[PDB]
Every structure is written in structure tokens, then in C-alpha cells.
Write an enzyme that holds these catalytic residues in place. Structure first.
Site, PDB file in Angstrom:
ATOM      1  N   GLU A 199       0.873  -1.189   0.000  1.00  0.00           N
ATOM      2  CA  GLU A 199       0.000   0.000   0.000  1.00  0.00           C
ATOM      3  C   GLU A 199       0.907   1.236   0.000  1.00  0.00           C
ATOM      4  OE1 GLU A 199      -4.160  -1.525   0.634  1.00  0.00           O
ATOM      5  OE2 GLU A 199      -3.080   0.041  -0.443  1.00  0.00           O
ATOM      6  N   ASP A 223      10.978   7.329  -0.328  1.00  0.00           N
ATOM      7  CA  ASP A 223      10.991   7.690  -1.729  1.00  0.00           C
ATOM      8  C   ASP A 223      11.543   9.092  -1.824  1.00  0.00           C
ATOM      9  OD1 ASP A 223       8.790   9.813  -1.940  1.00  0.00           O
ATOM     10  OD2 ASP A 223       7.639   8.134  -1.134  1.00  0.00           O
ATOM     11  N   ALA A 268      -9.414  10.223   1.497  1.00  0.00           N
ATOM     12  CA  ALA A 268      -8.784  11.536   1.450  1.00  0.00           C
ATOM     13  C   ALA A 268      -7.416  11.331   0.793  1.00  0.00           C
ATOM     14  CB  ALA A 268      -8.626  12.112   2.856  1.00  0.00           C
ATOM     15  N   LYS A 318      -5.822  11.474  -5.449  1.00  0.00           N
ATOM     16  CA  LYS A 318      -6.133  10.671  -6.622  1.00  0.00           C
ATOM     17  C   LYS A 318      -7.609  10.657  -7.020  1.00  0.00           C
ATOM     18  CE  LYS A 318      -1.923   8.450  -5.825  1.00  0.00           C
ATOM     19  NZ  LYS A 318      -1.086   8.194  -4.620  1.00  0.00           N
ATOM     20  N   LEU A 376      -6.131   5.235  -5.866  1.00  0.00           N
ATOM     21  CA  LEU A 376      -7.344   5.900  -6.291  1.00  0.00           C
ATOM     22  C   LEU A 376      -8.385   5.952  -5.192  1.00  0.00           C
ATOM     23  CD1 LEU A 376      -9.629   3.512  -8.439  1.00  0.00           C
ATOM     24  CD2 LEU A 376      -7.817   2.730  -6.868  1.00  0.00           C
ATOM     25  N   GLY A 385      -7.940   6.679  -1.863  1.00  0.00           N
ATOM     26  CA  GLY A 385      -7.759   7.644  -0.790  1.00  0.00           C
ATOM     27  C   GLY A 385      -7.916   6.867   0.504  1.00  0.00           C
ATOM     28  N   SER A 441      -3.715   5.200   4.930  1.00  0.00           N
ATOM     29  CA  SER A 441      -4.431   5.440   6.178  1.00  0.00           C
ATOM     30  C   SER A 441      -4.822   4.078   6.763  1.00  0.00           C
ATOM     31  CB  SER A 441      -5.655   6.353   5.982  1.00  0.00           C
ATOM     32  OG  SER A 441      -6.515   5.910   4.945  1.00  0.00           O
ATOM     33  N   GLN A 443     -10.842  -3.476  -2.458  1.00  0.00           N
ATOM     34  CA  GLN A 443      -9.875  -2.472  -2.053  1.00  0.00           C
ATOM     35  C   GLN A 443      -8.463  -2.910  -2.430  1.00  0.00           C
ATOM     36  OE1 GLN A 443      -7.974   0.628  -0.919  1.00  0.00           O
ATOM     37  NE2 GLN A 443      -7.357  -1.060   0.422  1.00  0.00           N
ATOM     38  N   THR A 444      -8.200  -4.215  -2.379  1.00  0.00           N
ATOM     39  CA  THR A 444      -6.870  -4.736  -2.686  1.00  0.00           C
ATOM     40  C   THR A 444      -6.517  -4.726  -4.170  1.00  0.00           C
ATOM     41  OG1 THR A 444      -7.705  -7.012  -2.471  1.00  0.00           O
ATOM     42  CG2 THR A 444      -6.662  -6.029  -0.540  1.00  0.00           C
TER      43      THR A 444
END
Ligand SMILES: Nc1ncnc2c1ncn2[C@@H]1O[C@H](COP(=O)(O)OP(=O)(O)NP(=O)(O)O)[C@@H](O)[C@H]1O
Ligand SMILES: Nc1ncnc2c1ncn2[C@@H]1O[C@H](COP(=O)(O)OP(=O)(O)NP(=O)(O)O)[C@@H](O)[C@H]1O
Lengths: 391, 391
Positions: free
Chosen positions: B41, B72, B99, B102, B114, B116, B120, B334-335
Site C-alpha cells: 500500500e 521515496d 482523502a 487521486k 485511487l 484515498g 491510512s 480495495q486490494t
């Protein structure tokens, strides 16, 4: 730097995020499956009332205006002002993600619901949603348009009846390609649900052509397997069945073999089907493989025929229904396609291992007929293997 | 039994929902799937900075205490206070579901991220998360404990660099069984990530044993296919390749057959892999079958052989990489294991149907060879088929 201001971080409030990213919530919004999952998200909640011994009748209707209503006779969605939110509980569950009475076993000991987002997702993805709740002597109604309440939930009348009716008109801004409901797709799920919930009258009406069904099969998952084999040809008479409850987990299995070569294990968790199987499927397959080979070995069939015997050979022509009742299940997605509750695998395995072994021993004729099929499968399989070289 | 009042309905605020139901967010929390996805993630966010042309190096470190950090050299998470949230943009993204930058193409033209939700969710399921953002000449640090900031984002020093570093300690209250990171699982992802992102130095450092890797391949997905086939035996000198961008969808395929019999098709959407495939796989498969079969027919191969040549035989011993670069991707979970955006199927299929056709024409030796393989496979399908249904 590059439109990377703090203002580049957009926060999606309410149901905005589900309309924005329907995929992680409803699944495939194009192939027609996520559209039907919209009816199912509602039905599941009604079935949940049935599990808790409240709802004994559910009526799903496809209306002529391309909307579906799901009416149940359970306790009805809570209507009173929410102690923390300030608006009716009914409105809270419809407009807030992760709001629901299924975050413990206080309202529902066992239920397919657990995310607290199901019906709010349907509401979010709907151009309009009509909600009518009967409970505590009053009829309550509330209209929604894209998740936004048109007025506060209103007490429209009086009634001794209890129940919840949710009618939604899916947003074509979300759903593409398949935009109209299909009777048979609803009928299949509803029929199995009837098999899974005896005593619950499930009626399916189609106001477009007048078609309708009333599923109220009482034979359980055993009659379900019988149904699954109707236009099939089972090879043995005794359907293998068991229903245990150990360490808080219920595992119910009904299965039977046919002369075909297709494998069909219908896995469920608290009545929610798992298209992607999961821990229950895993426990079932490992258990059946160990058991079947163990029988072939101890009975000398393996010796006699020098047969390998693999899961695939065994699952050829298998019609099985695996239903588990888990207190606090885990799903890898919002559409409950795969069951990820580790503890369930052992639960199903232990029971399959013991009970199926018993079945074989107690049903010699069945066991033999099936073993023959496995051996034959392993034979044809390796015959085809050798046939590669012998082209 | 009757427990159904407004108080029954619970609303999980903040990241509580994620902790409650980690499954629909991170997947399986017991077999290691979800555990490694936590890292992924994070990495994906850095890879998006890389896709945006701002990040050239990513260093992922597995620490001795079993935490993982990803550093990064990108723009860095916006540190500026969020206009409406009244807290740092960095804190908004770390603690608020849905949030991020993307929800439009302002900060990122294309990106795997994408929802958001990625980072988190990580923080939510991390007993601790250390965040260091090197942005606009200042170093900013903040610590979270189970999703809760321990102190607002603070500036700790001056800097000449820009970048984001997220070190996270998975919550043992969430993750069970497989809780230690597996270097190989990380290495595989990063190495393919290196292939998919030429120009980005991806470093893997295992602080437990000193094992390190530095992936910086430049042959693109073609080098990726070479790599995938090195342990195997490619049957033809030319890897089929193309990179097009039509209708706003970039599609890049690279494939090559080996004399084996397995099918290895790797599908990515904005560098995000699709274990369950999706629309790009569907289009790929379709166009592949059609093109080859068309070739076999026009070049009269079939007029001699007398075979149908199914896709499944055409895909034997095949290794292909299908990378799509889409604006607003859709995933059914979600994955992101399956791409559901229908427009990509048409896209991949058309491109493949054209260029693959040309390939067979522009590369005869290769074509005859591969077709030779297909023929043997289709023939063997029937030889084995004979013995199969011949006891
Ligand atoms: N037919 C119904 N009868 C009674 N209560 C209902 C009904 N439907 C919804 N509810 C209540 O409202 C809730 C929120 O429903 P929902 O939004 O769909 O989430 P859920 O029950 O947690 N399951 P899920 O689909 O996992 O997200 C459940 O928690 C029920 O208490
Ligand atoms: N290493 C990073 N460098 C720069 N910006 C980042 C980084 N990580 C996160 N961000 C910003 O913060 C955001 C929120 O990240 P996240 O919570 O992980 O959601 P996401 O990028 O929308 N993708 P997803 O996993 O689909 O939910 C992205 O929208 C980026 O703008």
C-alpha cells in the site's frame, strides 16, 4: 510543487466516496453483478432478521419502473433519534458508512452483515431510495435521492406490523452495460436462501411481466443438493450430510456425486455465498482429499489399481453445499466473496474428516461407487498424461 | 431476540472501522497476504510519485523488529494545513478514509492509487507509524500509535531533499500467525515494479540478516519477459511487444512462448497487479485466440491438421505481461485483484488484435514455430482426449 498543494488532497464526505469508487464497495458495476448485489445487500439484511428469528417472510419485487423493493417482517430498522448522531437511527444507517447494529452479537448473534455499509452503499448508488419502516406502532417513511435524505424520517401512520421495506432505483451514472434487473438472477439466490432458511417465506414478484415465485422449500441444504442434481445424474443414493456446532462455529454440509466431471461446491458463511471460496472451501477440500484417499488406501483400492487419487479426481462430479455459521466472520472484500476467517478451515476440516470417514464406512455401496469414480478419474487422467507422449 | 433500539446502531469513527473489519480493506490478516499488502500500500504511493515523474529511488527496509519502512525521493506528502480539515494535509491523509490526491488527475495523471485509503489503512492497522516528509526545504516528522497522532506534524530540520518515509509497525492485535515479513514476497513485487518502472532505483534492505537487493532494470516489460523465461526455454527469438495509448488508455503487452506447458500472464493496471485478472485479461485472451486462429486458417495450417485450436491450447507455455495505464481504473475490491473497467477490455483486445496480427506477419520464423507449438498442443488435446474418455 506539481499541483501537490494541501488542497490537492480531496476528502470525500458522506456517501460521495462510494459513488466515486463504487468498485471497492459494490463490485463490478458493469457486468451486471454489482447491480444485482444491490438487491442482495438489502435482502441479506432481511435474512439477518430471519436468522435472529424475527423475519418469517420476505418479498422481493421488480417494479415496472426498474426498481426493486425488499419487504421483510422483522423488527424494522431502528427509527428513534440516534443517541450520538442527532437524527433517526434509520437515517444514520442509510447515510453513514460503518454504521450498523452488527458490530457485536447484541442485535444479531450470527449474521452475514458486519461492515455497517451494505444498505448505505445501495442508497449511495441509487438515484432514489424509498424507506418504509413499521415498528413500535408507527409507519415511518423516508425518500432518498443519491444518498441525500429529502426530509427527516416521518411517522406516516399507525400499524401493529413490524418490518422494513427498502425500494431503490439504481443510478445509471454508476451502473453501465447491464442496467435492468434480471428475474432469474434474483430467483437463483432467493431460491438457495429459502433452502438455507426453512420457515422463511421468500416471494419474488416481477411487475414487468407478472411472473412470480414463492420459495419456501423446507428440506434444507439436503433438498438443496437434490435440487442441484435435478438435471444431473447422481451416482449414489445417500446424500452425505451433517450439521455440527463446535467451538462456537457451525458447519453444515450436504453433498453427492454425479456422473459428470464438473465440480460444484457452493460455499456460504452466515448465508452469504462465497464465489471465491475461502477458508471453508480450503478446509473442505483438504478434508475430503485426506478422507477419500485414506479410505482408498485402507480399503486397498489404491493398491488394487495403483491409483494416485488427487483432489481433482475426487471433486469430479461433486455437488456440495458447505454452510458455516461464524460468530465474527472476516471477508477480504465488501462483497463477501472469499471467507478469510482462519479458524473456520480447521472447523470444517475436523468435521469433514471425522464425519465423511464415518459416512464411507457406514455407506459401503455409496463409498464403492464413488471410489470407483475417483479411481476411474485418476485412470483417465494419467491415461491422458501418457497420451501426451503417445501422440 | 428483541435488542433493537437506536443505541443498537454503532458508528465507527476515524479508523475504527478498519481495525474492526480489516478484511474488506487489507484482506486476509492471518496468512501473510494482508501483512505484505501493508508494505505494498505504501510502496504503491511511492510508485505513483514515480509514475508522475518525481521519484527516482525507493528504498524499502525490513527492520529487525519486524517493521518496514519505505522511503521515496518524491514530492513528499503535502504538509500544508488542509483548508477544511484544519490539520496538516499529511495528517488528513494518514487518518481520514477517502482523502488523497487521486480523485482527479491534478497531482497524478495516472496512478495505481485511487481510493484515498491505502496508507491510512496501513496506519490504522499499525500499532505505530512513523512519518517523515522532506518537503519544501524542511523535514517534517509525526508519530502515530494505532492511527492516532501523538503530536501534530512537526518540522524537525532543514533539508535539500524532497521525499516521504513511512516506517510502520503492524498491530499484532490485527495481524496473526504470519507476522514476520518474507523477503522473497517483497523482492518479487519490487523487481517486477523495477521492470514496470524503468528509471526508478528500487532497493530492498533486510536489517535482519543483511540481505539486500537493488532492482534497476531498463528493458521494460520485455526484459521482464526475458527474466520470467530465463528459468524456462523460450521457443522463438522475438518477444512480441507494443506500447500504445488510444482512447486515453495506454496498453503495453510483451509476450513469449517457452517449450513448457504452463500459462503465465501477469496483468497490471497502473503498476498494480491483478491476481484475479479482469477486463485487460479478458481482452488479452480474446484477441490472442482470434489472432492465432485467424493466422492458422489464412496460412492454411488448419486445412491440413483438422483441429479447432482453443485459446487454452494457444496459451500453453506462454508467458506474457499485460500492463494497462488507465485514467480512472475500477477494481471490485480495495486490494485491487481484478480490474472491472469494461473499456479496457475493448482497448487491450483491439490493440492486441492489430499488432499481434502484424507480428505473425512481420515475424514468420516465430509464427510458424509458435503455431507449431499450438498444433502439437491442440493435437495432444485430442490424443489425451481419446485416452481420457477411453477408460
Ligand atoms: N431489513 C432490516 N431490518 C432491520 N434492521 C435492518 C435492516 N436493514 C438494515 N438494518 C440495520 O441497519 C444496519 C446497517 O445495515 P448495513 O448498512 O447494510 O450494514 P450491516 O448490517 O453491518 N452489513 P454489511 O452488508 O456487511 O455492510 C444493520 O446493522 C441492521 O441493524
Ligand atoms: N510517498 C508519497 N509521496 C507523495 N504523496 C504521497 C505519498 N503517499 C501518499 N501521498 C498523498 O496522499 C494520498 C493518500 O494516500 P492513500 O491513503 O494511501 O490513498 P491513494 O493514493 O488514494 N490510493 P489507494 O490505496 O487506492 O487508497 C495520495 O492521494 C497522495 O497524494
Amino acid at each position: 510543487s506539481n499541483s501537490s498543494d494541501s488542497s490537492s488532497i480531496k476528502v470525500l464526505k458522506g456517501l460521495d466516496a462510494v459513488r466515486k469508487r463504487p468498485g471497492m464497495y459494490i463490485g463490478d458495476t458493469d457486468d451486471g453483478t454489482g447491480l444485482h448485489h444491490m438487491v442482495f445487500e438489502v435482502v441479506d439484511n432481511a435474512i439477518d432478521e430471519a436468522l435472529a428469528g424475527h423475519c418469517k417472510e420476505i418479498i422481493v419485487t421488480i417494479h415496472a419502473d426498474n426498481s426493486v423493493s425488499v419487504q421483510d417482517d422483522g423488527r424494522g430498522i431502528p427509527t428513534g433519534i440516534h443517541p450520538e448522531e442527532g437524527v433517526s437511527a434509520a437515517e444514520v444507517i442509510m447515510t453513514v458508512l460503518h454504521a450498523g447494529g452488527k458490530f457485536d452479537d447484541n442485535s444479531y448473534k450470527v449474521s452475514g452483515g458486519l461492515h455497517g455499509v451494505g444498505v448505505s452503499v445501495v442508497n449511495a448508488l441509487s438515484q432514489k431510495l424509498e424507506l418504509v419502516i413499521q415498528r413500535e406502532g408507527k409507519i415511518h417513511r423516508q425518500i432518498y435521492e443519491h444518498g441525500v435524505p429529502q426530509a427527516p424520517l416521518a411517522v406516516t401512520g399507525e400499524t401493529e406490523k413490524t418490518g422494513t421495506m427498502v425500494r431503490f432505483w439504481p443510478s445509471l451514472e454508476t451502473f453501465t452495460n447491464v442496467t435492468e434487473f434480471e428475474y432469474e438472477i434474483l430467483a437463483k439466490r432467493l431460491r438457495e436462501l429459502s433452502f438455507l432458511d426453512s420457515g422463511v417465506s421468500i416471494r419474488l414478484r416481477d411487475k414487468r411481466d407478472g411472473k412470480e415465485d414463492h420459495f419456501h422449500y423446507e428440506g434444507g441444504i439436503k433438498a438443496f443438493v437434490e435440487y442441484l442434481n435435478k438435471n444431473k445424474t447422481p451416482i449414489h443414493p445417500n446424500i452425505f450430510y451433517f450439521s455440527t456446532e463446535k467451538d462456537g462455529i457451525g458447519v453444515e454440509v450436504a453433498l453427492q456425486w454425479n456422473d459428470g466431471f464438473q465440480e460444484n461446491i457452493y460455499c456460504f458463511t452466515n448465508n452469504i455465498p462465497q464465489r471465491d471460496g475461502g477458508t471453508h472451501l480450503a478446509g473442505f477440500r483438504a478434508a475430503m482429499t485426506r478422507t477419500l484417499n485414506a479410505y482408498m488406501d485402507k480399503e486397498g483400492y489404491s493398491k488394487k489399481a495403483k491409483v494416485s487419487a488427487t483432489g481433482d479426481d475426487a471433486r469430479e462430479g461433486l455437488i456440495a453445499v458447505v454452510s458455516v455459521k461464524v460468530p465474527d466472520p472476516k471477508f477480504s472484500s465488501q462483497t463477501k466473496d472469499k471467507l478469510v476467517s482462519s479458524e473456520v478451515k480447521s472447523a470444517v476440516e475436523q468435521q469433514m474428516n471425522e464425519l465423511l470417514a464415518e459416512y464411507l464406512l457406514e455407506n459401503p455401496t455409496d463409498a464403492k461407487i464413488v471410489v470407483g469414480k475417483i479411481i476411474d478419474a485418476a485412470r483417465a487422467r494419467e491415461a491422458a498424461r501418457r497420451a501426451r507422449e503417445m501422440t
